[PDB]
C-alpha cells in the first residue's frame, strides 16, 4: 500500500472448464473531469431540438461510470466460436470486479505549452450502487464500452439521468439525485479496489436453432382420427349446400390439428437493401410502427422476437424491428447502407412469425345464405394460451444484460433487444476524481470556489465473470452446421488488426448454430 | 426366461383407491416389416401434392411405435362414467409399461401359397428415449392407438419424422435421425421388456362446470358504490349536454364494475349444421381462420378455448375450431355430416366468449361537439391482465397429453388440443423386428444387402397408469347433472358390440357434468 | 518494496565446481516505446520488396523481448577457454533469471528543449510464455542479444511475428495474436520479477575432435579376412576375362571393408576468398543450393554438418554453408570480405564428407560383353542405415537453443545452425510499459486514444545458468590442442577494449579442440 509496489496484475485469460467458464478482462481507461465538477440540467429547451415528440429534462454529472454490458467485452472471437458451437446455453453465475494500479495526474497550461505532470496526494472515488437507489443507465445500449480489443485505451462516459417532464419542464414529482451523497470509496495510487456480485437465478439462453419447424409437429405417414370440414358446396349452381367432412392427413397438411400456435407479432414496415424496389416516398418516420407513451410517440426498435425475411428473400428487412450494428469507422448521421451491418434474424423462422407479414386472418362476419364469409387480416396478435415463441439471438456485440424495472407487473421480463433480464442486474460503478481546488483568495468571500486544477486519472480495470453452460447432447446423424473463418486468400485478416492498428469486426455473430428439435 | 414358460401374465384392470386410480390395460399387437429396412425420404415431390401451402420433407424409418396417448385406451366407459360423475379434477402421477409374451413369426410364398411358421431365433428390439432426443410424434393425435376394446389386435403404426424444408428440399439445418444409433434392448421369445416412469407435476383437469356465470358474480339485493355515467344528454334538441352518473344496481346489471373479464378469443366462422341456411358459396378454405408461419398457412383447429354455440341456438357449430370426431366406420373421404360426431362446448360458456363472436367493442374517434363517437369491434384480444379464462374440455376418444416444445418461453401451455401439456411426457417406445437376410451370394460382393426374410412378430403391452383424484365437496342443495345411458329400448346396447363384431362408440362424452362456483 | 530500497543487488560471476558451472549475467537495458501501442501488420506491399520470392505477411507489436540465445552473453572469453580446453562436452541443466531496479522514466519536449523526469507512478509489465501458446521468434539467430561486454547498455527488440500468406495477402488460416491477452504481471519502481527454469534432458555437445578419421579405423599391421575382387582382366587383347579376388590389406587402404560410412551430404558451391581463381560470373542467387516450400525457394544457409575446405586448401569455402559473422563495427550491406568472420570447420572433417565435393560415385548401366560400365556422382545422399555423421561446431557468438518445431515427425532434431535443440526451450521473456494517455478531451469521445505520453524504462536482468559439463578422460600420451592468445606485440589486448570504448572480438572461437578416439 504505498506508490512504489504495484497494486494488482494484469490478468486477461479465459480458462474453459467441462461445466462453466471463467472469462477475466483486463483493460486501462483514462477518466477525465466533466462538467467542471458541477451538476446542471439537460433538458433540451437548453439544448434546443424544439418538438414534443422529443422532449426529456434531465440532469448531467460530473460522475463517470463503466459499462461492459457488451459481450465483445468479455470473449475474444475466437473464445465465443468455442461458445456456440459446443454449447447449447449459457447463464453467467458470478462476477467478480477489480480496479487497481490507479494513477492521478494533473496538467498545467503555462505561456501556451501544456505539461502534464504526476499528482502523488490526489485521489479518485468511486463506488457501485447495490441497493439499486439511483437511475439504472447501463441496460439502454449506449457506446462507451470495453474496447473490444484488450490493448486500446478508452475513455469512460458521463452519467446523467432523465427524469419526468412536461414538456421540457420539470413537474416535480421529478427526482434530483446528487451522487456525491453515497458513501464512495475513495483512494489514492496505492490503494485498490474490488467487489464481487453473484447473478440471480435466470434462465438459460437458448443457443440453438429448432430443427423442426412448428407448423410441421406430425407423424407424415400416418392421418390424424379428427375430421375438417373440407367441402361446403354440393357443386356448382343454386342451392347445392353440403357438408363434407374428411380426414385430415398427410396429403392435406396445413388443415391438421395443431396444440400449439407461433408467438406473437406487432407488424413491422418491409424495406428492401435493393433501393430501386422500395416505394419513391419518406416512409421512414411516417410509416414505422410506433408505441406512443402519454402523448410521446415512441419507435419501435427491437420488439417481439419475429423473423424478419421470410424465407426465400432475403432482399429486405423490417423497417425498425432488426438490430442494426454499424461497422468500424462508420460516419455519425446519413451512412450509407453498406457501411452498416444489418443484422437478420433466420434461425427464429420456425418458432416466430415473420416480422413483415400478418400474423394471419379471422372471420369477421356471420355467414348466411344471403351474406358471404368475410375476413380480415390480424396485423396485431398478442399472447393467448397455448402460444410458444423464441426470443430474439444475442450477438457478440449485443448487450448481456438489463435491468427489469421494478413494477408491479411484467409478462415475460426478457429483454426485447436481447440479453439477460434481471430484477438485480450487477450494479453500476461510478467514478470520480476528487476535486483539488486552485489557490483561493485570502480573505473569507462565500461563494463556492469555482476555480480548479485540470486532471484526470488512468488505471486498469479487471472484470471477471463466471459463465454456466449447457452442453449439446443431440443425437443427430449428419453434419451440424457452425461457424468458420472464410478461407478464400483476403487482404486483412478478419477479426484482426488492420495495416494502421484499427481494429475491425467485419460481420456480427449470432448465438444459433446448433439445432435442436422442438 | 425360455421358450417354454410364458414371460407375463394378462392384467387388466381398474383398482379404484378413494384418493387415487390404477388403471392397468393388457392388449395384443402385431409389427409388419417397413420400408424393407430401410430409411427413406418423403418429400411431397416424391409424393406429388404439389403447392406452396402443403411442403414437407422428411424421412421414414422401418420402426414402430406404440401410442396410448388417448384416453379409451385406458378407461372403459363405466370407469369414465364412475371417474367423471364423482370427481372434481385428475391428473396422472405415474406409468408402468412391460411388453411380453413376444413371439416372431416367419412368412414364407412357395409355389402360389403363402405358409406361416415360427422362428424362434429372431429377435425384436425396443427401446424408450428417455432423453427426448428424437423428434416427438405422440402429441399429433395420429391414429395408431390401443384399440378402445380389449379383445380387437391392432397394427402398430410406422415412426416418420417431419424436418426443415424450403419447398420440397432440405435447407441443411435440417436433421437426420438414425434410430438404430441409440441403444435399443433386442429380446427373443422367452424375454420380456418393462420400464417405470412418474409424470412430472402438473395442474389438475377440471371437470367441473362452473354454477354461477363471470358476467353475473354479486349480490342481486345490493346496490355497488360506484356510480357509472347513465345518461350524457339533458334531453331533445340542440346544446341539450349534461352528465348524469348514477348508481349501477339490479335493476342495471350489465354496467356494474367487474374487477374480472372473460378469456381470450381469436374468431372463428360460423357454420350452420342445417344446410339451407349456410351460404351458397366456397368459404371452406377461404373463409377459415389461419395463422401464417414463414409463409405457409396454417388452419386454426382447436385453439384458445372458447365456447361454440353460444346458447339458444344449437343449430351452428365453428367452421374450424370444434373437435370433430368419426364415427365407428366412417368412410375417409367427403363424409356425409350424420356419419360424424362433431363435439360441442357448452361447458365452458360461463368463463370463456363464444367462438364465433366478437370479443367486444372498442371506442375509436374522440368525440367532440362535431364529432360522433364510432366504436369498432373487437375481432381478437389476446391475454390482458385481470383475464379468466377456462381451458377445453378433455373427451375419452381425445389426447392425454402433449410436448410443451422446448422453447424460450411458452404461455400457459396447456395443449390446444386438450390434456396435460409435459416438459418431459412419457417416453416414445419404438420397436422393430431385427432384419434377417436371406442367403447371401457366395462370392463377396460390396453392396448391401438387399433381400431378406418377411417376418413380423406379436405379442402383449402392460400398461399402466397411476391416476391422482380430486373429489367433489360441494354442499349443493338440488340434484347435480351427470352422464347416463338411455333407457329406451334401442336395437344395440351403446358403447358394445354389434351382431357381426364391430365395437363402436355412438357419441363422445366429455369430462364436464359437476359444477363448481367459480 | 518501496521507491527507497534497491529491489536487487547485481551478481555477475562465474563458479566453476567440478562437475558443473553456474554462470549469472547481470546487464542493465533500456525498453522504448514501439509502433505508438499499437498492432499493425508488415505485409511487404505495406514495405516493399516486390517479388514472388520474398513475400511476407505478420504482425508488429508494441512488446519487447529479451533474447540471450547467444553464447557470448552468458560466458567470458576466459570462461570459455576454461569450458573447452578442460572438457568433453556440456549440457545447461537449470535457469533462473531475475528483472529488478526497474525503474520508469518521462520524456517531455517543450518549446524546442527535451527534458527527462521520473515518473514514479507508472508501470512496465512482463510476462514469460511458459505454455508455448505465441510464435517462437528467439530461435532464427536475430541480433539484440544482451550485448557480450557487461558494461555496455542496450536496446531491447521488438516483438513481431510472421504468419501464413499467399503472396501479400493473409490466407485466412492465418492467427493474430494479441499478446496483451495473456495473464502478464504487471511491476513499478520497488518491484522485481524472476522465474526458474528448468532444462529438459538434451544429449551433451560434443566438444572433442576425433584424434582417429572414419575411412582409417582399421590394423594397419593385419590383413582382413575378406577378398575384394581385384582385377577383372587377364591382360590386353580380346576375350582376356577373369576373375581374381584378392586379400584386403594395408598395401591398399581405401578397399578394405567398413562396417561404417560418413554422414549425409547435400552439396554446396565453393566459393575462394582468393578473388581471382572464382568465376567472372554472378553465381550467388543462382548457383546456390536452395530448398523450396510452396513455391518460395529458400536458401541452404547452414545445412547438414559438414566440412568445408577439403584438407590441403583453405583458400575456398562454401557459398552459404559456413556461418558467417561480422567483426565489430561491420557495415550493413556489401561488406568487403576481411570485415567479415567466415566461419571454417575443420574439425568434423573425419567424420563428415566436404560441404564443396561429391558424396560418392554409383554405378548407373550394367555391364555387359557389349556395355562398358559407367558410374554418376552422388550429389546428395541422405540418411541411411549404419551412418555416422558429427553435428556441426558451437561459437561463441553462435546460439545457444532452438525449438524443435511441434510436428508428426523429426530426423535428429539438432538446429542446423548449432546449439541445442528442445522441444520446450526457456520461455519467451516479453516487456512492455503500460500506456499512460495524455489528458483526454472533455466531452466523452467514442474513438479510443491515440494520445500518450513518451515513455521508456531502465533496469537489470540476471540471467543465471547452470551447465552440466563432461570431463577429458583421455590418456594419449603427447601434448593436447587447444587454445590460446597470441603473444606478439599487438597494439591493442584481443577481446579487450579499444581506446575510445569499443568492444570487439577478433576471431570466432570454436568449441572443439580436445581430441577423442571415434
Known sequence: DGVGSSSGNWHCDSQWLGDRVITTSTRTWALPTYNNHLYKQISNSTSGGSSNDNAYFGYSTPWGYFDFNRFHCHFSPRDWQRLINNNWGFRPKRLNFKLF?????????????????????????????????????????????????????????????????????????????????????????????????????????????????????????????????????????????????????????????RNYIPGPSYRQQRVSTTVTQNNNSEFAWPGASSWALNGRNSLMNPGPAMASHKEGEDRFFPLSGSLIFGKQGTGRDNVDADKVMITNEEEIKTTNPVATESYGQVATNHQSAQAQAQTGWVQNQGILPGMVWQDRDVYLQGPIWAKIPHTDGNFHPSPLMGGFGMKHPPPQILIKNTPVPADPPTAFNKDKLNSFITQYSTGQVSVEIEWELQKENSKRWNPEIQYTSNYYKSNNVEFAVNTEGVYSEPRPIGTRYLTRNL
Chains 1, 2, 3 share one sequence.
Open 101 to 257: 494500479n490507479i494513477q492521478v495526474k494533473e496538467v498545467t497550461d503555462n505561456n501556451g505549452v501544456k505539461t502534464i505532470a504526476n499528482n502523488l496526494t490526489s485521489t479518485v472515488q468511486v463506488f457501485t450502487d447495490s441497493d439499486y437507489q439511483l437511475p439504472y443507465v447501463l441496460g439502454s445500449a449506449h457506446e462507451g464500452c470495453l474496447p473490444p480489443f484488450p490493448a486500446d485505451v478508452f475513455m469512460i462516459p458521463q452519467y446523467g439521468y432523465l427524469t419526468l417532464n412536461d414538456g421540457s419542464q420539470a413537474v416535480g414529482r421529478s427526482s434530483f439525485y446528487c451522487l456525491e451523497y453515497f458513501p464512495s470509496q475513495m483512494l489514492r495510487t496505492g490503494n485498490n479496489f474490488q467487489f464481487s456480485y453473484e447473478f440471480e437465478n435466470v434462465p438459460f439462453h437458448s443457443s440453438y436453432a429448432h430443427s423442426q419447424s412448428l407448423d410441421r409437429l406430425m407423424n407424415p405417414l400416418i392421418d390424424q382420427y379428427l375430421y375438417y370440414l373440407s367441402k361446403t358446396i354440393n357443386g356448382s349452381g343454386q342451392n347445392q349446400q353440403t357438408l363434407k367432412f374428411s380426414v385430415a392427413g398427410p396429403s392435406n397438411m396445413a388443415v391438421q390439428g
